[PDB]
Structure formats: C-alpha cells, structure tokens
C-alpha cells in the first residue's frame, strides 16, 4: 500500500549522467531444436529511460513482442525485459537491436547459443517531462522482494492501480481506489516537483528530465522493520533521502537543502516514520502471508560449468546459475581456495521471464590447469554454498 509523498521545493531567485545500456540475449531455458522457448533481450543500467528495443530475426524486425514495466535498480539506472517466445533451429540467427540516445547507431547483439525469511516491499516511481509532446510521462511499480505486484502507468487508457500478480488479485475495491488515487495525486506532485527543480538549476523548459523515488520497508523473518526507505533523485543523481532514523535528511546540494528545510518545517519524516512503522510493514506482512506459497519459497540455482578454448593455450571456464528465486547470488571463482578476485568477470543478473534469475561468471584459465579452479555459489535456496568444477 502507498504513501502520499511530498513535493520538492522550488529555490525561487546542472549536470545530466548518461548510462549507456547493457544488452544480453538469451532463452528462458536451455535451447533445445523443436521445443518452444522464450527469447529474452535484457537491457540494464541505462540513462536516461526512453529506449527502442527490437528483437530480429535474421535480420528481420519482430513483431508481437512484449515488455516488462519500466523500474531501475539502486544506482538508478533503468531496466527492461523484452521477449518472445520462439523455436530456435539451427541456422536462424537471433539478435536484439537497441537504440538509445548514448548510441549514434542502433547496437545489435546476437543470440548467442554457446528462504532467509527477511523481505522487502518498494515501490519505484519514473516521471519524464517531455517538452513539447504533453505532460510527463508517470510509471510506478510495487514489488515485494523480487516479484512485481502492481504497476500504475500515466499513459495507459485509464491509468490505475493493476494488480501484477496473483495473489494481490483478492484485494478489494477500496484497495485499488485508494492506491489509485494516492498515484494520481504522487503523479502532480512529482510534475510540480519538476517544475521545481527545472527553476532551481536554471535550466530550460525545452529539455526533458527524470524525477525517481523509491520508498518502502525490510522485514525481518518475525515480521519487524529492519530499515525503512525514502530516496529521491533528479536526472539520475540522488537528491535528497531519508536517513536510516527515519527522522533527518541527506541532501545532495544547495538546492536540495531548500527541499530539506521545506520539509523540516513541514515534519515530512515524521508522516514518512508513521507510514514505515506502520501500514509499509503492516501491508508486507499481509501480501507475505497471502502470496506465501511464492514469496515465502526460495528456488535454489541449478548449476553447472562449461569450458570454451580461447586457442589451444588458455580458456574461458563459465559458472552457470539458472532457475534461482530470488535475485540475490554469489558466484566467485577460487584457484587453489582463494578467489579470483581481479580475473572473474560477473554477467549482471538477469530474469529468466518466469520469476526466476539467471547469471553466470567466468574466468580464463591456463590450459591444463583447469582442475584446479572451483566455482563457489551462495544463495539463500541453499543450505550450504556449493562448490563445483569443470
């Protein structure tokens, strides 16, 4: 359940970060010829939000595919699923093309086919003037741990509170008129809130720029707050948050310090303490037990390495985790016990498309000596770490 949020001071009387996207192709699950499949492309930690996405297939342009709801991740920065579901064969060539304003040509990448009982609830809210072209653009999304459950869209032909998964259906209507009407109101004030901020670094009103919060609260596996959360960001770059007290403010710069004492005087961290004591842990508490047979089960990753020469004097060993719920992994490489610190590269985690998460490391090792590498995995599915080799 939402919270009403304040609205960020004006200052009466400048940088903009660009993040360009990662972009990883891949199947749900391991691509077997006849058999049906999803064909995801994956793209993360780009800035700022709009981006072009298409799925080819030799070459050609995809239709039908679909899309998950725009959130970001802790630095900000955004991400997207885009899938469809396919039948690879053998000599059809799969890519993912991407245009994105950091890109001065669209990118393609190929297909390649070579619990803890504590939880979280956040929402996350995106809003994107666009000069020009009406007023902006307003996206929020609930999710407990890692499962989506609501999402509200600005956009869509009657923006409202949607449920997103199953076991947030059974709630009534007060519910959804509620929450829907604490976004539609969260929804003018992050307009005037840009509005705002647009004056405070004298910028123009012809350029587009990205308001992000995020609030919510963690649980422990008794049910009691573990920490709470109030974070705000403008273009990419944090703003102003509520401290872990739930009682004071860390603001980013002049401008956000006019924000800080606005809010002061209006005791904003107290309505925000009241709200991550109360109805944030109270409503997690309640989807956990509604949603228990999903959100209270951990999947464990299933694991595997394999081995892919670079020439006949070294080699790629990769350490496969698939299928693992929820997100949080480690995958560390170790030759003769201690880790490989400098020479493993980390693949982001990425969704499968069916709640589960996928992610791999890798290390190039000399040839010959691959046996005496271990890969070290650490997932809350798991009663122990497990180890494996090639």
Same mark, same amino acid.
């Given at each position: *359940?939402?919270?009403?949020?304040?609205?960020?001071?004006?200052?009466?009387?400048?940088?903009?970060?660009?993040?360009?996207?990662?972009?990883?192709?891949?199947?749900?699950?391991?691509?077997?010829?006849?058999?049906?499949?999803?064909?995801?492309?994956?793209?993360?930690?780009?800035?700022?939000?709009?981006?072009?996405?298409?799925?080819?297939?030799?070459?050609?342009?995809?239709?039908?595919?679909?899309?998950?709801?725009?959130?970001?991740?802790?630095?900000?920065?955004?991400?997207?699923?885009?899938?469809?579901?396919?039948?690879?064969?053998?000599?059809?060539?799969?890519?993912?093309?991407?245009?994105?304003?950091?890109?001065?040509?669209?990118?393609?990448?190929?297909?390649?086919?070579?619990?803890?009982?504590?939880?979280?609830?956040?929402?996350?809210?995106?809003?994107?003037?666009?000069?020009?072209?009406?007023?902006?653009?307003?996206?929020?999304?609930?999710?407990?741990?890692?499962?989506?459950?609501?999402?509200?869209?600005?956009?869509?032909?009657?923006?409202?509170?949607?449920?997103?998964?199953?076991?947030?259906?059974?709630?009534?209507?007060?519910?959804?008129?509620?929450?829907?009407?604490?976004?539609?109101? *969260?929804?003018?004030?992050?307009?005037?809130?840009?509005?705002?901020?647009?004056?405070?670094?004298?910028?123009?009103?012809?350029?587009?720029?990205?308001?992000?919060?995020?609030?919510?609260?963690?649980?422990?596996?008794?049910?009691?707050?573990?920490?709470?959360?109030?974070?705000?960001?403008?273009?990419?770059?944090?703003?102003?948050?509520?401290?872990?007290?739930?009682?004071?403010?860390?603001?980013?710069?002049?401008?956000?310090?006019?924000?800080?004492?606005?809010?002061?005087?209006?005791?904003?961290?107290?309505?925000?303490?009241?709200?991550?004591?109360?109805?944030?842990?109270?409503?997690?508490?309640?989807?956990?037990?509604?949603?228990?047979?999903?959100?209270?089960?951990?999947?464990?990753?299933?694991?595997?390495?394999?081995?892919?020469?670079?020439?006949?004097?070294?080699?790629?060993?990769?350490?496969?985790?698939?299928?693992?719920?929820?997100?949080?992994?480690?995958?560390?490489?170790?030759?003769?016990?201690?880790?490989?610190?400098?020479?493993?590269?980390?693949?982001?985690?990425?969704?499968?498309?069916?709640?589960?998460?996928?992610?791999?490391?890798?290390?190039?090792?000399?040839?010959?000596?691959?046996?005496?590498?271990?890969?070290?995995?650490?997932?809350?599915?798991?009663?122990?770490?497990?180890?494996?080799?090639?």
């Amino acid at each position: *359940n939402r919270v009403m949020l304040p609205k960020a001071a004006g200052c009466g009387a400048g940088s903009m970060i660009q993040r360009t996207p990662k972009i990883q192709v891949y199947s749900r699950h391991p691509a077997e010829n006849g058999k049906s499949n999803f064909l995801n492309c994956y793209v993360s930690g780009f800035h700022p939000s709009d981006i072009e996405v298409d799925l080819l297939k030799n070459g050609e342009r995809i239709e039908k595919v679909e899309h998950s709801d725009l959130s970001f991740s802790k630095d900000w920065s955004f991400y997207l699923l885009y899938y469809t579901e396919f039948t690879p064969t053998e000599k059809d060539e799969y890519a993912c093309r991407v245009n994105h304003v950091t890109l001065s040509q669209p990118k393609i990448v190929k297909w390649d086919r070579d619990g803890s009982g504590s939880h979280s609830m956040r929402y996350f809210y995106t809003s994107v003037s666009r000069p020009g072209r009406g007023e902006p653009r307003f996206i929020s999304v609930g999710y407990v741990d890692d499962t989506q459950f609501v999402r509200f869209d600005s956009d869509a032909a009657s923006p409202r509170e949607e449920p997103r998964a199953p076991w947030i259906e059974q709630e009534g209507p007060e519910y959804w008129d509620r929450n829907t009407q604490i976004c539609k109101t *969260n929804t003018q004030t992050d307009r005037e809130s840009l509005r705002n901020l647009r004056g405070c670094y004298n910028q123009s009103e012809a350029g587009s720029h990205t308001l992000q919060r995020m609030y919510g609260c963690d649980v422990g596996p008794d049910g009691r707050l573990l920490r709470g959360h109030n974070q705000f960001a403008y273009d990419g770059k944090d703003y102003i948050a509520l401290n872990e007290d739930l009682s004071s403010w860390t603001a980013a710069d002049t401008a956000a310090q006019i924000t800080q004492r606005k809010w002061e005087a209006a005791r904003v961290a107290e309505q925000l303490r009241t709200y991550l004591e109360g109805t944030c842990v109270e409503w997690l508490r309640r989807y956990l037990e509604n949603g228990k047979e999903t959100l209270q089960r951990a999947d464990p990753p299933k694991t595997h390495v394999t081995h892919h020469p670079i020439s006949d004097h070294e080699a790629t060993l990769r350490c496969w985790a698939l299928g693992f719920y929820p997100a949080e992994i480690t995958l560390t490489w170790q030759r003769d016990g201690e880790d490989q610190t400098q020479d493993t590269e980390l693949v982001e985690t990425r969704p499968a498309g069916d709640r589960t998460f996928q992610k791999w490391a890798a290390v190039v090792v000399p040839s010959g000596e691959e046996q005496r590498y271990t890969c070290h995995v650490q997932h809350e599915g798991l009663p122990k770490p497990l180890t494996l080799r090639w």
